Amino acid sequence: KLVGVAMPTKDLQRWNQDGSNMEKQLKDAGYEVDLQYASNDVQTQVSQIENMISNGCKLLVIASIEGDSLGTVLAQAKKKGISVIAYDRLIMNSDAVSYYATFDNYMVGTKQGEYIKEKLNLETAKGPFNLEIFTGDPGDNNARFFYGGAMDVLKPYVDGGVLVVKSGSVAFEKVATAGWSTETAQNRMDAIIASYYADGTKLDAVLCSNDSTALGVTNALTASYKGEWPIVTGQDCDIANVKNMLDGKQSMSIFKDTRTLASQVVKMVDAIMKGGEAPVNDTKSYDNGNGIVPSYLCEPVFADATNYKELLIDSGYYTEDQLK
Numbered sequence: 001k002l003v004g005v006a007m008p009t010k011d012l013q014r015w016n017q018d019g020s021n022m023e024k025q026l027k028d029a030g031y032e033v034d035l036q037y038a039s040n041d042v043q044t045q046v047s048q049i050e051n052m053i054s055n056g057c058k059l060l061v062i063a064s065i066e067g068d069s070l071g072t073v074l075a076q077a078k079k080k081g082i083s084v085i086a087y088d089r090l091i092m093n094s095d096a097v098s099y100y101a102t103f104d105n106y107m108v109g110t111k112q113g114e115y116i117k118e119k120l121n122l123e124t125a126k127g128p129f130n131l132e133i134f135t136g137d138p139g140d141n142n143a144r145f146f147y148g149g150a151m152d153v154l155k156p157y158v159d160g161g162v163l164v165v166k167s168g169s170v171a172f173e174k175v176a177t178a179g180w181s182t183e184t185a186q187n188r189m190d191a192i193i194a195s196y197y198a199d200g201t202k203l204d205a206v207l208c209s210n211d212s213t214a215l216g217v218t219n220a221l222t223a224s225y226k227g228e229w230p231i232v233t234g235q236d237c238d239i240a241n242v243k244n245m246l247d248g249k250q251s252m253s254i255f256k257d258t259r260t261l262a263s264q265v266v267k268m269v270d271a272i273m274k275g276g277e278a279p280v281n282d283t284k285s286y287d288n289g290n291g292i293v294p295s296y297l298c299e300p301v302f303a304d305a306t307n308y309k310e311l312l313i314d315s316g317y318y319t320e321d322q323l324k
């Protein structure tokens with residue numbers, strides 16, 4: 001009854017909660033757990049999964065750093081009859097993936113796009129408004145979905161000249177942030193401020209696909225930008241970002257309750273290991289390159305400073321001390 005749980009890094013906040021919640025809920029359900037974090041190093045994650053298999057893990061729950069990097073080791077699991085659940089991020093180009101548990105990532109993107117569209121009055125305004133864009137790591141299939149959802153809302157207005165991206169970086173490849181790194185985002189935003197918004201130009205919005213990139217952006221804006229504060233989006237309700245929202249430095253975030261995701265994954269583990277139907281609610285949205293992966297999509301929730309206490313504190317997700 002040993003289950004392996006592979007998380008990408010502790011340096012991006014949520015995975016600390018994902019891993020802890022997985023471990024707690026698996027142990028409550030009667031499993032033994034081998035939980036490991038890979039410091040966002042792909043070869044480390046590969047070696048950790050190899051070791052889980054060697055230690056006799058009967059099922060693998062994997063939150064991959066790079067979606068297409070695990071093909072060899074997952075073939076080993078498949079050969080041994082070990083089921084694989086892709087956790088939050090989809091594992092790509094492998095026929096070894098049994099199930100996928102995540103939040104509705106396209107909807108996350110939609111919400112971020114619609115927020116900017118609403119606050120900039122794009123349905124009725126001539127503009128132009130100045131936009132910059134920061135998305136996630138190109139090896140994370142989720143980043144494609146966050147970008148795609150937001151762009152499906154906003155791209156028509158960029159095409160129409162209502163939104164202007166002064167840096168010229170609009171394409172996914174140009175706006176992706178390696179490792180979802182706060183520091184990398186900060187360095188790029190600093191260069192964009194210095195090059196394009198050091199004169200009187202107002203930066204009206206920054207579409208950030210998550211909180212770690214938003215944090216880098218707001219760090220740079222604090223340091224170097226002298227104009228009226230832009231719309232800044234995000235996702236995860238990281239503690240640093242919630243505190244920034246309380247100080248007016250981030251507009252909104254998206255709350256994804258990792259306890260709920262973990263609960264759904266343990267239902268899948270139980271179905272596989274003890275018997276039953278693994279819960280799924282989508283076998284149409286996520287093709288991993290080998291084919292459709294049966295998925296369970298949890299609902300993401302809009303958060304801002306007017307509902308964060310109800311969402312995060314009254315729900316028991318954070319303690320009140322954490323947000324001081």
Ligand SMILES: OC[C@H]1O[C@@H](O)[C@H](O)[C@@H](O)[C@@H]1O
Binds near residue numbers: 236
């Ligand atoms: O950790 C960086 C990002 O990774 C994505 O795959 C997750 O869906 C996000 O919730 C997270 O902010």
Ligand SMILES: [Cl-]
Binds near residue numbers: 011
């Ligand atoms: Cl780590």
Ligand SMILES: [Cl-]
Binds near residue numbers: 167169174188192
């Ligand atoms: Cl750029």
Ligand code: NA
Binds near residue numbers: 016017019020
């Ligand atoms: Na933890």
Ligand code: NA
Binds near residue numbers: 039040041
């Ligand atoms: Na690393």
Ligand code: NA
Binds near residue numbers: 117119121
């Ligand atoms: Na509006």
Ligand code: NA
Binds near residue numbers: 271276
């Ligand atoms: Na089953």
Ligand code: NA
Binds near residue numbers: 279280281
């Ligand atoms: Na179902």
